[PDB]
Amino acid sequence: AGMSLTQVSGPVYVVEDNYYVQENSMVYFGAKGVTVVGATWTPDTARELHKLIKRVSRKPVLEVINTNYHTDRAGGNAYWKSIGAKVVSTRQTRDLMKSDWAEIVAFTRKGLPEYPDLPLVLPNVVHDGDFTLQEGKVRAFYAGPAHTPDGIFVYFPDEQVLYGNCILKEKLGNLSFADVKAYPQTLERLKAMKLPIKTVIGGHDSPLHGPELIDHYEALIKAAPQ
Ligand SMILES: [Cl-]
Ligand SMILES: [Cl-]
Ligand SMILES: [Cl-]
Ligand SMILES: [Cl-]
Ligand SMILES: [Cl-]
Ligand SMILES: [Cl-]
Ligand SMILES: [Zn+2]
Ligand SMILES: [Zn+2]
Ligand SMILES: [Zn+2]
DSSP: OEEEEEEEEETEEEEOSSSOOOOOEEEEEEEEEEEEEEESHHHHHHHHHHHHHHHHHOOOOEEEEEESSHHHHTHHHHHHTTTTTEEEHHHHHHHHHHHHHHHHHHHHHHHOOOOOOOOOOOOEEESSSHHHHTTTTTTOOOOOOSSEEEEOEEEEEETEEETTTTTSSSOOOOOTTTTHHHHHHHHHHHHHOOOSSEEESBBBOOEEEHHHHHHHHHHHHTTTTO
């Protein structure tokens, strides 16, 4: 299908968004409602995700996290705002989005001319640092720069699932905006946290991996050109 929504563990679901270049996002079905992690590529892809969500739960979409300022994590924002869902990010992500959205949209349209010329839609819930949602069961944190300067990890402690964002994935991928030397230092900062991890969800390629995805990408980025 164009998009799928699939249970990984308990209330934790993976979204495979096969629009444009495949990106994987997540959904958490909570007591009061639904948290989306990654806004998806466009307002259209966001509507498609919302349609899948409504087939699983009647509860409201409470909030959507922009895990970085890029089009694949924030492109859906217009749609999420339109249904009254909070759009959530760190201050850094919001500031970079304000300054650099036009440029990341232009860069996206270079490789994907079919991609829409989306206007800026900023987060309206902006956090000073690390933060949690869903009674502490969804935990967003910064461990340094990697694919972008601002990209955060999202950890689900009950299910021991780590969302890898654009930071962790199977293929080395486009290193254009990447801090290549800092990248492994961020992954080692993550390792030093010693989070219990059974599952890592890569933000591109095939989503479902074990904790080895971290080591897999670390080895790839340490061999990169640059
Ligand atoms: Cl399922
Ligand atoms: Cl353009
Ligand atoms: Cl990222
Ligand atoms: Cl593998
Ligand atoms: Cl694996
Ligand atoms: Cl792996
Ligand atoms: Zn990106
Ligand atoms: Zn990405
Ligand atoms: Zn793997």
